[PDB]
Nucleic acid binder design. Sequence first.
DNA 1: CGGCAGCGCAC
DNA 2: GTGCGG
DNA 3: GCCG
Length: 327
Amino acid sequence: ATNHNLHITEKLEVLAKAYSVQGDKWRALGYAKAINALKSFHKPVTSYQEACSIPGIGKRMAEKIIEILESGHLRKLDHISESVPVLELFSNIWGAGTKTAQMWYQQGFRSLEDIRSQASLTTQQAIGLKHYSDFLERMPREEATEIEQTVQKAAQAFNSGLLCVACGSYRRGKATCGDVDVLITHPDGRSHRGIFSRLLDSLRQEGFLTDDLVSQEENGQQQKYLGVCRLPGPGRRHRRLDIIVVPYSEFACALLYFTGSAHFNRSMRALAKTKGMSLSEHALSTAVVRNTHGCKVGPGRVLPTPTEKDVFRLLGLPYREPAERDW
DNA sequence: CGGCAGCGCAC
DNA sequence: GTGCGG
DNA sequence: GCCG
Ligand SMILES: C[As](C)(=O)[O-]
Ligand SMILES: [Cl-]
Ligand code: NA
Ligand code: NA
Ligand code: NA
């Protein structure tokens, strides 16, 4: 759906990113929601009244929208800190957010070279830095597919009945992907256990995993690995690879969560809430039990969901294909 | 105004 | 406990 | 930033 408000959304995106790299996460979020509404409007917004009719756009946002529409410029951009470009440069490093970016800037650092030379780095950030270029580029989905295949092959060597699926933008059908999330489980509900570790050993021993960002993360019965891989062959770049092993009873919700997008997941939690339910990568549950003070005193009951559609059904929603989950 | 999810990790 | 990314 |  062509954007009939590009000259607007463009300027709005610049201001958004600026708030984002400076810590104003919520304000940046608000902008993002309005920016999406605009991109997909059935016509170029021509009035402040029209703008306000679109959910996600309030008085403040309409003000700016109409200013750009009529004047062609956004005065606020003219007051955006000189630091923004550098804060964005530094935050492009995996492991460094706004606080770290700000710290570096205040220490006089300006280039990725200053960072490499005089900045204190965490293990993750150091890895993020030497793979700056590689990590900044989105890979063709074909490469994501080879990466998924590499993991699945090494995994089925331990148990042929294991189920492996690449999620993220890749599962949403995007031509290119920023990383790869391989979700693994087993239909028998139990044989996924004792797979995670030896799967990582195997992949390391075959030279596929080049660096670890988080070797192991335990979230309930989910085991997650955040790392870096590089397919065999010359000319291959290093890529962000995540591996998640979950028990079959949480497969659908894990699938839903890791497929995203982040905006989709957020809209689904909001909906679940209105129905008195909660949604996580673990399950769809009835809302938690809380005392008079309004505080969790007892967990909700998990509502079984064998497949993704079971999740939509219980939320009273029509199923949406992965391809239609950008928002 | 408070909520916009909750999480586990490195540090 | 904070920063960060999923 | 927006929403209720
Ligand atoms: C427009 As209102 C009720 O969010 O202040
Ligand atoms: Cl499913
Ligand atoms: Na970053
Ligand atoms: Na506020
Ligand atoms: Na977060």
